[PDB]
């Protein structure tokens, strides 16, 4: 008596589950009432941010001739690009080596 | 002849508690910074808001100078240099220095 | 539950041939759960300061403009506004 | 009055000197003033923008004191005395 259940992530053109973040906003107790179009915005911005760090991680993994993203590559991707870095300034990546710096002291 | 008047100057100013930068030029500076992000429209300011912003700016600057002067004594000299202020901002953190 | 399937989907969309290690999948899996936490925690008290009880899309837009710095704001605020209209479109 | 001073130069040299004297500093170099007026500006550039966004989220046009103290509490510097 109904149509095929097109999920709401499909009708918005995204990959992140809008139903899941809708349930997380409701049960999270952030506010008493959650709007309709608000979790779609949340899923689109999470999709854009994860696509950004995965793109930088892939570019940082290609030049090391490795075809599999390990956490060292995510540290290089995060620390190299400053706009992301300020957002993640507080976080520490587990098993992430410090970006190579010699502090400009060497023999001529 | 009055030597080391900085000692009585500092002992006077640390005892005092009023705001130090003049009110009207600080209001013109904050209204200058305001107009660049409102894409042309002007905003008004409540009279308590500009006083609140001036209190916060004065407190942040006196913290920055008290952090920089420890580095100035750390380098063995007495006069504050801008490399010390840049280093104190480079070392305080990402949300503590800016 | 986790977010592991969607990180894999976005990775295959951006790079065709690359793969992601299990620990890096756990990194991204905690990262999503942190950024969503900070954005929704901002939008909660933004709704609370103005005596509103609903989180509308204006609140997520102003919370992402409060949190994401610089050009990462100006792209993502597009990506929401590009998305939500399409959601109303269908 | 006759001529207009630079708007950015709203903080005079004795004013910055008086700030550093309140900070317990003995001696000031001459090159501080071309840079501390920089480091004040970026501070306001961080705070004022956040306050405007708060005023932008409501329909209101004037920035109140509550929006500045909210813009400072979110950045980390709680200001007591006006909020409430």
């Amino acid at each position: 008596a109904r149509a095929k259940a097109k999920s709401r992530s499909s009708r918005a053109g995204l990959q992140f589950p809008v139903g899941r973040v809708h349930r997380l906003l409701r049960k999270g107790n952030y506010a008493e009432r959650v709007g309709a179009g608000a979790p779609v915005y949340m899923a689109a911005v999470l999709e854009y941010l994860t696509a950004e760090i995965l793109e930088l991680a892939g570019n940082a993994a290609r030049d090391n001739k490795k075809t599999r993203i390990i956490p060292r590559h995510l540290q290089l991707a995060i620390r190299n690009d400053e706009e992301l870095n300020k957002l993640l300034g507080k976080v520490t990546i587990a098993q992430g080596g410090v970006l190579p710096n010699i502090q400009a002291v060497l023999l001529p | 002849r009055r030597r080391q008047g900085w000692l009585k100057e500092i002992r006077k100013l640390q005892k005092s508690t009023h705001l130090l930068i003049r009110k009207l030029p600080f209001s013109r500076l904050a209204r200058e910074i305001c107009v660049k992000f409102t894409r042309g429209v002007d905003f008004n300011w409540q009279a308590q808001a500009l006083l609140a912003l001036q209190e916060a700016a004065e407190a942040f600057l006196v913290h920055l100078f008290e952090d920089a002067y420890l580095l100035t004594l750390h380098a063995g000299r007495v006069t504050l240099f801008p490399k010390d202020v840049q280093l104190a901002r480079r070392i305080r953190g990402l949300e503590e220095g800016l | 539950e986790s977010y592991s399937v969607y990180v894999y989907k976005v990775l295959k969309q951006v790079h065709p041939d690359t793969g992601i290690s299990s620990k890096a999948m756990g990194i991204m899996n905690s990262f999503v759960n942190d950024i969503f936490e900070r954005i929704a925690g901002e939008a909660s008290r933004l709704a609370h300061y103005n005596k509103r009880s609903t989180i509308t899309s204006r609140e997520i837009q102003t919370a992402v403009r409060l949190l994401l710095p610089g050009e990462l704001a100006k792209h993502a605020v597009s990506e929401g506004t590009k998305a939500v209209t399409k959601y109303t479109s269908s | 009055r006759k001529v207009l001073r630079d708007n950015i130069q709203g903080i005079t040299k004795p004013a910055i000197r008086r700030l550093a004297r309140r900070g317990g500093v003995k001696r000031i170099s001459g090159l501080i003033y071309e840079e501390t007026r920089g480091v004040l500006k970026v501070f306001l550039e961080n705070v004022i923008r956040d306050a405007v966004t708060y005023t932008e989220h409501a329909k209101r046009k004037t920035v109140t004191a509550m929006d500045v103290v909210y813009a400072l509490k979110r950045q980390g510097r709680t200001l007591y005395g006006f909020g409430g």
Binding site: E83, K86 | R90 | - | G38, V39, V42
Partner: peptide, 18 residues
Amino acid sequence: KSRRISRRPSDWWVVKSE
């Protein structure tokens, strides 16, 4: 695309003019 372009300014952090 016109995605954000990461420059490498002399300042480690964004103080002025990105």
